[PDB]
């Protein structure tokens, strides 16, 4: 659930943009990074992906390959290049505030929904 104090665009950046950061991370990266998200949530988010490119690279995906959204609703775009991502997966038995995560680096195209003025990512697809 998006905290009401954040726009869709702000919440996307909080959850998914680690702007201009190292693609390689420690194995504790996700456990530490997810606290900022889960502090606003009722229960630990089960999976989450962070992108490491500079912010403007992620915003540029809104001007790259148009594709259909998974839900069929909205304007979705696939990145021209593979992004540097980190996938976070909640460990079994975790219960807030004891949320620990597996950390997995990766390099793949991302798909985002874009909306608004400015026209920026609002949903990781």
Residue numbers in the entry: 0 to 124
Sentences from the paper on this structure:
Based on the structure-function knowledge of the RNase A superfamily we have engineered a chimera that combines RNase 1 highest catalytic activity with RNase 3 unique antipathogen properties. Based on the RNase 1 scaffold we incorporated specific regions essential for RNase 3 unique anti-pathogen activities within the RNase A superfamily. The solved crystal structures confirmed that all the chimera proteins reproduce the kidney-shaped folding typical of the RNase A superfamily and thus keep the fold of the templates used in their design, as suggested by circular dichroism and molecular dynamics analysis. Nonetheless, the structures that incorporated the key features related to RNase 3 antimicrobial activity retained the overall RNase 1 active site conformation together with the essential structural elements for binding to the human ribonuclease inhibitor (RNHI), ensuring non-cytotoxicity.
A first RNase hybrid construct was engineered to combine the high catalytic activity of human RNase 1 and the antimicrobial properties of RNase 3. Briefly, we incorporated the N-terminus of RNase 3 (1–45) that encompasses the main antimicrobial region of the protein and consists of the first two helices, which include an aggregation prone and a lipopolysaccharide (LPS) binding sequence. On the other hand, the hybrid construct conserved the flexible loop L1, ranging from residues 17 to 26 of RNase 1 and reported essential for the protein catalytic activity. A first construct (RNase 3/1-v1) was successfully designed with a catalytic activity 40-fold higher than RNase 3, but alas in detriment of its anti-pathogenic activity. The first version of RNase 3/1-v1 has twelve peptide chains in the asymmetric unit. The maximum RMSD deviation among backbone chains was 0.7, being the highest variation located within the last five C-terminal residues, suggesting that this region has a higher flexibility in solution. To note, the last beta strand was interrupted in residue Phe123, turning the C-terminal tail towards the active site cavity and, in particular, to the B2 region. We should also bear in mind that in the original RNase 1 structure the C-terminal beta strand includes two residues (Phe123 and Ser126) that are directly involved in the B1 cavity. Here, the location of these residues is displaced from their original position, suggesting an impact in the B1 base binding and selectivity, as later discussed. Surprisingly, the R1-L1 (D17-R27), predicted as highly flexible in RNase A studies, is here perfectly superposed between the twelve chains.
